[PDB]
Enzyme design. Structure first.
Site, short mmCIF file in Angstrom:
data_model
loop_
_atom_site.label_atom_id
_atom_site.label_comp_id
_atom_site.label_asym_id
_atom_site.label_seq_id
_atom_site.Cartn_x
_atom_site.Cartn_y
_atom_site.Cartn_z
N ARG A 68 -3.02 -1.70 6.77
CA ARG A 68 -3.52 -2.18 8.18
C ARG A 68 -4.58 -1.15 8.57
O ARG A 68 -4.56 -0.84 9.61
CB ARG A 68 -2.25 -2.11 9.11
N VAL A 98 -0.29 -8.96 8.94
CA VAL A 98 0.54 -10.34 8.82
C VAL A 98 1.05 -10.91 9.97
O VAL A 98 1.64 -12.17 10.16
CB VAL A 98 1.72 -10.07 7.77
N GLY A 119 6.85 -5.38 6.37
CA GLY A 119 8.20 -5.41 7.28
C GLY A 119 8.29 -4.11 7.73
O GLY A 119 7.85 -3.11 7.38
N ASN A 172 0.62 -1.24 0.02
CA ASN A 172 0.05 0.15 0.00
C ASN A 172 0.71 1.27 -0.09
O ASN A 172 0.37 2.47 -0.18
CB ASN A 172 -0.98 -0.09 1.23
N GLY A 207 5.36 3.05 -0.66
CA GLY A 207 6.71 2.75 -0.69
C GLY A 207 6.93 1.87 -1.62
O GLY A 207 6.48 1.78 -2.77
N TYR A 260 16.66 -7.35 12.47
CA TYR A 260 16.32 -7.34 10.83
C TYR A 260 17.04 -8.04 9.96
O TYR A 260 16.60 -8.59 9.20
CB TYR A 260 16.60 -5.65 10.35
#
Ligand SMILES: NC(=O)C1=CN([C@@H]2O[C@H](COP(=O)(O)OP(=O)(O)OC[C@H]3O[C@@H](n4cnc5c(N)ncnc54)[C@H](OP(=O)(O)O)[C@@H]3O)[C@@H](O)[C@H]2O)C=CC1
Ligand SMILES: NC(=O)C1=CN([C@@H]2O[C@H](COP(=O)(O)OP(=O)(O)OC[C@H]3O[C@@H](n4cnc5c(N)ncnc54)[C@H](OP(=O)(O)O)[C@@H]3O)[C@@H](O)[C@H]2O)C=CC1
Ligand SMILES: NC(=O)C1=CN([C@@H]2O[C@H](COP(=O)(O)OP(=O)(O)OC[C@H]3O[C@@H](n4cnc5c(N)ncnc54)[C@H](OP(=O)(O)O)[C@@H]3O)[C@@H](O)[C@H]2O)C=CC1
Ligand SMILES: NC(=O)C1=CN([C@@H]2O[C@H](COP(=O)(O)OP(=O)(O)OC[C@H]3O[C@@H](n4cnc5c(N)ncnc54)[C@H](OP(=O)(O)O)[C@@H]3O)[C@@H](O)[C@H]2O)C=CC1
Lengths: 227, 242, 229, 230
Positions: free
Chosen positions: D42, D57, D85, D19, D21, D148
């Protein structure tokens, strides 16, 4: 920002070993994409409507002359696909010096000769794609191939050194590493096709691969997964 | 099962390029470990403390004679350390065929010539350790090293093919890949070049020849029998990636 | 310069999951090497005369308490071997969230909990060896191991990020990646399984004074099984 | 044998984190290619040009509901792009259990939840592309990213285990590993520039195309050479 596939740029392409087999599939795919495609041959001539130049990649003088012929015909080579290669398999104890050096000279040094000659203009024009055709064997180590695996792994190191020097000038070097091309070690449980190899080369020659440098693109059905 | 370090076995070792520099540190470490250590040289002579054989690794006939001389002195080679190597760096556009082929012939084909000759007795006795000295450049690609990076990456492919063929016979081939190691050549670079190289090293220091030798010592030991086709980076983290 | 094996330093060692199996062999090897060896257990106790601390690596508070007990006994941990692990295999379409997260939480997050707690003192003392026990599956991808392969590959990323941050302070993180260990042969060039003592030999090397310039590395102990890219 | 680019096949695509970037550029590229594209969000919604389904997620039941909503809109997902992420960087000594687990739960376990939910119909139809968006950090180890880098390397192991199991059924899993990308903002980058979201999208386009059937378990780095190594 443009959302879709970038506008196509017709590049001057040279495919070594482009007269038959996988190299011919690569050449035909890049021509169909819209590129100006030349191929090397050792006497068979060039198929279809592709520009042919005679070139043995073990001969630095022939490589120099072949690139000059291509430049006069279609402009300096912007995309080099170093597909010319040979196999001389043998188990280690039976592998001779001649059999090792022949495979090194064609597959590794021959690729260097072409990349080195291509860089003369690529660096000046601030654009170049050097695309080596490697092998799953380079990093996976097929057992009767000390010479072939050495040569094909050597292309990775060469591509990465070239990229570290020249990517800032718009010149990248990458490796397409095919597996078995037309089963127990292949997750896909099938061999690949020459057209699948050509599809990865087409991607690396395209306007979608500018930010890829020093990469190995495995086209092997998962065979070479590891470290 | 014994808990501690396995009982030491004294191996017949040959270190090519073992007569000076990093190779000499490798040879001296293996001798201190308890092995029977031979080194090659190209006419300047053996070190006072080590058995030496004259051998140019670009000459297959000289490689064969040298292995025979080692065998007579200390038994057939069980551990080969291929350290013989040269550099001929250049920008890609400036690198001649000769500069490329000379580096390939010594560093890659010369290592093959020695591994091939060593393998004869190794397979028959069901034991062998072939240890190639590679470089961070093989997988990281130091600039101006199309030849050196190609040679040192080629050692990985060769080690893996040899291992896939001969590991079942107790013969493994592995690569030690040093990063920037303190030598006379590195201490002679301008301080800017030496400082610039540290920027790429997470450890923020150069390595020593004895650290390279420590990795070789491990791969020659009874603790490395189940390691085949591996790259052991001795580079302060410099080469981390994919 | 010293020609032979560098002078030995007796390190404060903690081996998680050190009461049996590979962990027990690692702990016994490091003790034979001359180190001061502690192990975690979950109630069974420590072997031999080694120092035992009760610790479940899914519990951050228990990890904190365990390191404090080791510190009081033998000095702050200088060499951490994160060996505690579990497997819960399944075909992808049969693998549940619970089965995935259980393996992640012990094998990956549990290793993090121990490394993070060890870093309290390692950075200040300008020495640390964080040694994760990974698996060939991390980069080779054994089937039916989406969870286990994810966790064991994650150890590589974590070791490399830890090493890039802290190697300048003398703290390194590395992975030993065993293949099949006796506690399949068609995929192993060596045509045999490995032993726990072979894994311990690799850990012994990484804990030693011969491994100071090794950071973010994967040492495969797998008979060549995982060779690839 | 066909000489040129294989005939295009329009796939049902779901892009998690599609949605905004980089994920939005991926979704827009795949739509421009001719695919039927849905994205997750979200609660802030998808941009007006794309169909959106609400899906966190970290919630397995929400993932299940999202896939069903996509199925009813455009057919079962054939190409899953897992881009959802977060990052919560910290020095190792400062990083908390919460900060580590949050990144793992979204970036690694969240990718698993989506791959697991996609797998049933992909296996039945004997076709599937599972494309994880990783990071140069997974194999290069950017500092301050124990969480990460762990999550993004874990995607590689997961992709390889999935591929080893399911490549024989026509289902592959691969990783695109971006370096520094403009929408998410140098001596370590050989290209001496950041990349663009559209360059990441080009690699995803390739992996979703008829030119990538024989590629399984691969890491495609889109990083200007930054991550070269071993
Ligand atoms: O790959 P794949 O097609 O699968 O394997 P192939 O054997 O089918 O193709 C090998 C290719 O490499 C070319 N080639 C081999 N050696 C040289 C050389 N010294 N100089 C120039 N071209 C060379 C061959 O040309 P040639 O037709 O002359 O063998 C052929 O085009
Ligand atoms: O530092 P470093 O990289 O080690 O550089 P160094 O000069 O320190 O070491 C290079 C080593 O390789 C040897 N060597 C180089 N080429 C050959 C060859 N063709 N045959 C045999 N030995 C060879 C050298 O022997 P030598 O210098 O005695 O020829 C020397 O021992
Ligand atoms: N072939 C093999 O065996 C291979 C193993 N490995 C790895 O090696 C390591 C050890 O293997 P192995 O000995 O074979 O496995 P084992 O089952 O034999 O032992 C695992 C150890 O981990 C401990 N443990 C498990 N969960 C926890 C927890 N939540 N908190 C604390 N301790 C815990 C166990 O303690 P407890 O006794 O209380 O259960 C036991 O000591 C693992 O990381 C495994 O993934 C990797 C490659 C191959
Ligand atoms: O900043 P970035 O530009 O990196 O975007 C992060 C993306 O990931 C998505 N994302 C992050 N966490 C989750 C999650 N738990 N579930 C679904 N999507 C997620 C975001 O969606 P969003 O912006 O909807 O949270 C956004 O699309």
């Amino acid at each position: 920002a443009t959302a879709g596939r970038p506008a196509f740029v017709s590049r001057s392409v040279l495919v070594t070993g482009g007269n038959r087999g996988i190299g011919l599939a690569i050449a035909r795919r890049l021509a169909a994409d819209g590129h100006k495609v030349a191929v090397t041959h050792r006497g068979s001539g060039a198929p279809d409507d592709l520009f042919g130049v005679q070139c043995d990649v073990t001969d630095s003088a022939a490589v120099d002359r072949a690139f000059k012929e291509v430049e006069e015909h279609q402009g300096p080579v912007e995309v080099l696909v170093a597909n010319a290669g040979i196999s001389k398999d043998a188990f280690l104890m039976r592998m001779t010096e001649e059999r090792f050096e022949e495979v090194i000279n064609t597959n590794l040094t021959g690729a260097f000769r072409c990349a080195q000659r291509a860089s003369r203009t690529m660096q000046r024009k601030r654009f170049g794609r050097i695309i080596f055709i490697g092998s799953v064997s380079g990093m996976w180590g097929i057992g009767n191939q000390a010479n072939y695996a050495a040569a094909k792994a050597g292309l990775i190191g060469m591509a990465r050194s070239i990229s570290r020097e020249l990517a800032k000038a718009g010149v990248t070097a990458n490796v397409v590493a095919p597996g078995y091309i037309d089963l127990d070690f292949i997750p896909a449980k099938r061999v690949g096709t020459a057209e699948e190899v050509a599809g990865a080369v087409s991607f690396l020659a395209s306007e979608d691969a500018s930010y890829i440098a020093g990469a190995v693109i495995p086209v092997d059905g998962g065979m070479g997964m590891g470290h």
